[PDB]
Amino acid sequence: MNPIIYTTLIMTVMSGTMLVMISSHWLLIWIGFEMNLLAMIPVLMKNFNPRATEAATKYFLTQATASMMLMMAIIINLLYSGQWTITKMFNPVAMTMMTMALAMKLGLSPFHFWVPEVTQGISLQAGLLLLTWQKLAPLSVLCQISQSINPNLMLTMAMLSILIGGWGGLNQTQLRKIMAYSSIAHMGWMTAVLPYNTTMTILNLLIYITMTLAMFMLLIHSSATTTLSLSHTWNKMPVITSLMMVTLLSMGGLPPLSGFMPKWMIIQEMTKNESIIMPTLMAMTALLNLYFYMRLAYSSSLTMFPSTNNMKMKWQFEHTKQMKLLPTMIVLSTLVLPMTPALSSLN
Amino acid sequence: TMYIAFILSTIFVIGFVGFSSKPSPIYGGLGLIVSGGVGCGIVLNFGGSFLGLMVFLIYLGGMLVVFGYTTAMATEMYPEVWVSNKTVFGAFVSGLMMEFCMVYYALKEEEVEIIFKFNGLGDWVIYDTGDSGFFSEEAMGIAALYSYGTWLVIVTGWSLLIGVVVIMEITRGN
Amino acid sequence: MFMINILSLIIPILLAVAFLTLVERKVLGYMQLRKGPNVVGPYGLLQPIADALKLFTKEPLRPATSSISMFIIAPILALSLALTMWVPLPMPYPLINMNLGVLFMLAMSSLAVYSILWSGWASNSKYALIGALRAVAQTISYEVTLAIILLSVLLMNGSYTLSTLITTQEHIWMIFTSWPLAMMWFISTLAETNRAPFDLTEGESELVSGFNVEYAAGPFAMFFMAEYANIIMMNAFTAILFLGASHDPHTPELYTINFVLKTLALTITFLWIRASYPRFRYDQLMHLLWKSFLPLTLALCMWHISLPIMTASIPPQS
Amino acid sequence: MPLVYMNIIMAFAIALAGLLMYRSHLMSSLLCLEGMMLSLFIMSTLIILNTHFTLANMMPIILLVFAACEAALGLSLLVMVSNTYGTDYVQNLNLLQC
Amino acid sequence: AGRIASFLKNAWAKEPVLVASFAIGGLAIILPSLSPYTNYAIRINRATPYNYPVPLRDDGNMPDVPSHPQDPQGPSLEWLKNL
Amino acid sequence: MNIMLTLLTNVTLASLLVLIAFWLPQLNAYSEKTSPYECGFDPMGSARLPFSMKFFLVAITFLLFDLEIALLLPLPWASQTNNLKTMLTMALFLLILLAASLAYEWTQKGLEWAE
Amino acid sequence: MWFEILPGIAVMAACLFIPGMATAHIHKFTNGGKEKRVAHFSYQWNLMERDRCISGVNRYHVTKGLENID
Amino acid sequence: PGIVELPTLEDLKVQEVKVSSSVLKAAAHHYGAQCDKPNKEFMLCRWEEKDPRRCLEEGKLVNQCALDFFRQIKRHCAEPFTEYWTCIDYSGLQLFRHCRKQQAKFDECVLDKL
Ligand SMILES: CCCCCCCCCCCCCCCCCC(=O)OC[C@H](COP(=O)([O-])OCC[N+](C)(C)C)OC(=O)CCCCCCCCCCCCCCCCC
Ligand SMILES: CCCCCCCCCCCCCCCCCC(=O)OC[C@H](COP(=O)([O-])OCC[N+](C)(C)C)OC(=O)CCCCCCCCCCCCCCCCC
Ligand SMILES: CCCCCCCCCCCCCCCCCC(=O)OC[C@H](COP(=O)([O-])OCC[N+](C)(C)C)OC(=O)CCCCCCCCCCCCCCCCC
Ligand SMILES: CCCCCCCC/C=C/CCCCCCCC(=O)OC[C@H](COP(=O)(O)OCCN)OC(=O)CCCCCCC/C=C/CCCCCCCC
Ligand SMILES: CCCCCCCC/C=C/CCCCCCCC(=O)OC[C@H](COP(=O)(O)OCCN)OC(=O)CCCCCCC/C=C/CCCCCCCC
Ligand SMILES: CCCCCCCC/C=C\CCCCCCCC(=O)OC[C@H](COP(=O)(O)OCCN)OC(=O)CCCCCCC/C=C/CCCCCCCC
Fold first, then answer.
1. CATH assignment at residue D45
2. In chain C, which residues have their Cβ closer than 8 Å to the Cβ of E32?
3. What is its main location (chain A)?
4. Measured between alpha carbons, how far is A189 from A251 in angstroms, rounded to an integer?
5. Alpha helices, H only, chain G
6. Which of A175, C168, D40, H106 could be joined to H84 by an S-S link, Cβ 3.0–4.6 Å?
């Protein structure tokens, strides 16, 4: 694909997301979603192969179904209220349709399978863009319409997302599938805290985006897509493996790393609303995410797996391309716990 | 009354039941064309002649490409029709019976569905007494896409250009 | 009385179709140095009757591999839409005075496209399938070009009403106003009606009768009637759109005579073109409209948007 | 609410159920996807015309535009899948596993 | 201007349809901004009375608002009559 | 009412013509009479097999351009507005974007049929 | 010669005369000897309905005037 | 939430203007120029009150002015007006364009007589 075409497709995806985030009209929000999907599909299919084609097909089908449900919700809300402005929806059925459509777009359980399937199908850069941006937009819409979200349905989907992400990531060995299940679990956390504090939702979104960017940039640097492929990186550049081990510890929520701040603030906020069973279950379920993070860390950094013979030539050569802002992502994803009270600025 | 719009709505639902039972893409396109024409009739009765003719023309053009694509990529030795396959016929009969139950119950009594509440009375009664003069309100509202709706024109044109670029890129292969 | 009006619109149209068959035979004969039908009746006037009776007394057959439901529907749809295209035409008073008298024509033409597609697919024959796909490609090309050309020409008019077209052309002719769009529209009408040089769906030399290879006796005659009715209807549409006749409300017969004369001239031009020219190749037809007509059509659409604004001559809405 | 809206919403529900229940062909699912937006168009224009929302008459046109943009996207993906596997069957889209 | 002239000559010999299309489009874009009749078209469209001219309550300080349609006050279409 | 009546009239006439065609003449049909036609020899395969479509991309572009003509159709009423400058600017914007799409496809060889 | 094509063209022209002339005659016959009223808008339709109401015979083409006001 | 107040059938009675649409369209500009005062008063009442029940007297005055105008036309120029509206009535669209001669005769009749 031509570089100009690639950059204009990326700019069109970002334009669609910005249209969603700045529009006050439901029709314009739907237009933004449609533009985002339309420009996103070729980005997934950039590196042509059967896996990329299948991932793009599944993602397109899921997003088209979600967009149809979202438009139906918009029309139903218009019927009972005659309003197009994005505010508290005036019909419970329209709200249920909108919530299910946005959950399907975000990949929340039980609409999750496409997330690991597409993430394994597509390359590392495509997966990074997918996770980050395509979680950024629907969560913006949900934060806008939070005051009419049904707490029971939202919390049920969030808990299902957390459990399913933990179990799937526990079973998987492929790095992209592990990242997808981690994304599912973090989406569960954020949507669980959504009906109480959209500021906490945004804080968790920022921390998750930073950690995911750092992890995907490290994976791109190591050029590893499986566990065994990552197990050879210690013999070529052990710094990358150490930084990735620290990032993995952060993603599990271990103090005093950055990953503990979202869980801590979400638990506090949800406890303020006289909810204890849900925060306790959400905290206890994250141990599965921590377990498969630790299993990945054992293979890559804390131990030394066998290597091969051409790794000598790999030693002789040097990494040419540079991914700027990677050190900043590594710092911000591990060492921003003391700066927690900035969430008021985020407010 | 004459129940013209209601009969057309029933035909619309029947065509949807057909192409959702999905015998083959040929008959699905036939059912979709029938549904588009009947919906054009419905909205013609409700007032929007331009919108009805527009949607009918758009779907007639769209199903033309689908015919060429199913002849090329979605055909088998024995294409399935509604009575050909047990599953297709079962789904078709299930849809027909569900529609029949809904219409019969709504006609007999004011049916309150588990989802919405529908009142059994006249689509003619729901209309409005007031009227315009020497211009079509639908036509003026649609033509306002250029005086008003500058943003909509921009986003739609960019979406179409990007769609052309996208269909160029996807089918590139290699 | 409305049923009497419908019958008066229908039956003379079929009579004109049959005698257009005869006229085309004789015109091609005399352009090819022959005589054409002159034996069956006085100057061959009974030849259409003989052909119709033979076709409707001959045995029709259904192919063993054919899908019978869509095999029967296609001629019905073709003839029904061919007859339906005549209801909004003002001569000078339309049978049905539609407010949007052009979008109905476009929609019914696009629906009449599917008659040949379903006849070819239902026939379950290779030549019928090839004819059907040629119809698909031809429909694509002429559909986009016709849409833009018609939009521009009616933009010069003010609305989508054919009586309004008459009122617009009261003084001068749209042929004088917009002759390039007129030439491209004439080519597009040829392509739409599947006449030479664009008779690709039924190309006798390349395919054995194309989509109607398996159609015989009455069902074939229905396709022939639909084709000729569409030819006359599109020539009448072109005459109304570009050659505007003067209208006298107290004696509307003069408008009818002028309209019929213009329609006959355009139909004879159709036959003249068929006699004169070879046949296109459907990919060359697709490249003819998309690569030649479409750019110039877009340019002329921009020009005809800008012209009334820049000359303070925007037509009245009503 | 009159029964016309009931029938239109029922049509949308039927089209949605048809999409979510594949049989063999990706093309048939695309046809079901096109029916959903047809029902949405009809419902939206019936609501707008009844309430005389004059400026809202341009919404259904944009709805149709993005409907056929989605249709184009689906056709492109379908032709790529057909070139890959020889048939448009959805059973062949199983290389990736959840 | 020699290179431009050579390009135009080659395009006219090769793609007259494209040359004509681009010329017509350029004329359609440039000309409306220069024609003095665009404002006349705007005024003609503005002068079309689609809806009823609802009268205004007279509070005694409306000298330029006529009390009768035939009074000298108010808009005049004399410019339109001879056009 | 009148449009429904005339549609019914046309469909009824066509159906009556079909009925006359299929019931008036004498019928004598056997296996070879109704066999598929392949210029005198039996068909090698089946007509229901996939038939390659060399202009698949042009069909999708036709879908998009049909959308374009749908957008452009309400222009005659749009010329009656007071905001003539804005209307003309947006109409020319749409037409220029359509021309740009055509130019891009042509230059990238989307209009050339597959070999 | 070439003029033997004329009789077929003459018959076709006569056949094409019938629809328009018949429609005009039926319009005049069913509208009281006048052109059929064209109501492209709600205002014109309301004019037709008011004409039906004022006539007193349920026919819009029956027109009443000064002799009817007094 | 209350009972809708509806005027009785007795006070809705008024002398109707029983002319046809062609007759009204023939004497349209003259009627607008002559009975402008009651028509403008009634339209102002309708657009300010936003209630059909509060401007019945203005409607009756409009009817009275229209009847006086038509009686004044009939007493002086019955024949030219009859010819004018007969000409206008024939056209399906009721076009002023086709009846310029009769319009001129009617204008001459009303300019001198009245
Ligand atoms: C109960 C009847 C069931 C019929 C089922 C079959 C037909 C389905 C479509 C609806 C009925 C037909 C149209 C009714 C219109 C009613 C309103 C009306 O009269 O409006 C006047 C309007 C008048 O035009 P106007 O709307 O511009 O003007 C408004 C009115 N005046 C003039 C006063 C300003 O008529 C039209 O606009 C004509 C539109 C015709 C559209 C036809 C659509 C259907 C085409 C066939 C569809 C099926 C294809 C099947 C293919 C083969 C399958 C095997
Ligand atoms: C321009 C018009 C266009 C549309 C034209 C539509 C068709 C019009 C046809 C009109 C004439 C039809 C004549 C009958 C055709 C019979 C065909 C056939 O198969 O025949 C062989 C068959 C032969 O039967 P058979 O008994 O020998 O069958 C045994 C055959 N073998 C041995 C091979 C198995 O004849 C019949 O079946 C008898 C038919 C009798 C007539 C049927 C009704 C016709 C009514 C016509 C109008 C009458 C008007 C009133 C009288 C006027 C008198 C001046
Ligand atoms: C007005 C409505 C017409 C509907 C369609 C009727 C068919 C005719 C259509 C118009 C064209 C006419 C052309 C000329 C005549 C030829 C066609 C014709 O008339 O054919 C008649 C057919 C002709 O048979 P045929 O198969 O020999 O037809 C070919 C005819 N020739 C030889 C001329 C080519 O004859 C009959 O149908 C006679 C028996 C009548 C009674 C039985 C009818 C069928 C069974 C129905 C009942 C089943 C249950 C029984 C128990 C009931 C009680 C429980
Ligand atoms: C309405 C009644 C009028 C009917 C007109 C009929 C004309 C006579 C009948 C002719 C027989 C028609 C059958 C033949 C069909 C084929 C026609 C045909 O081939 O023409 C297409 C042919 C291209 O084909 P090729 O040369 O092979 O490919 C070019 C490769 N670079 O040429 C065309 O594209 C025609 C389009 C151009 C015609 C329009 C003229 C443009 C002149 C512009 C000047 C006017 C500018 C407008 C105003 C500008 C501001 C004042
Ligand atoms: C203008 C829309 C695009 C806006 C910017 C988006 C950039 C990213 C998206 C790219 C999609 C746009 C694709 C369209 C342009 C690309 C086409 C292209 O590359 O070539 C252009 C093509 C090349 O031809 P050749 O090289 O000679 O062919 C050789 C074959 N052997 O030539 C062209 O320029 C055709 C373009 C015609 C329409 C261009 C549209 C832009 C024109 C704008 C003029 C109006 C401006 C308004 C100002 C008003 C002043 C009062
Ligand atoms: C104004 C008063 C003065 C009048 C004189 C001014 C006239 C000059 C105005 C500019 C002229 C433009 C010349 C450019 C055309 C030449 C480009 C060219 O030759 O491209 C070559 C090449 C040849 O075609 P092939 O596919 O190779 O044929 C097959 C060979 N085996 O053509 C192409 O590649 C296609 C180029 C893009 C096509 C663009 C068509 C769509 C745009 C036209 C629509 C209307 C114009 C749009 C608005 C214009 C104003 C912005």
1. 1.10.287.3510
2. 306, 309-310
3. mitochondrion
4. 13
5. 6-29, 42-55, 66-69
6. H106
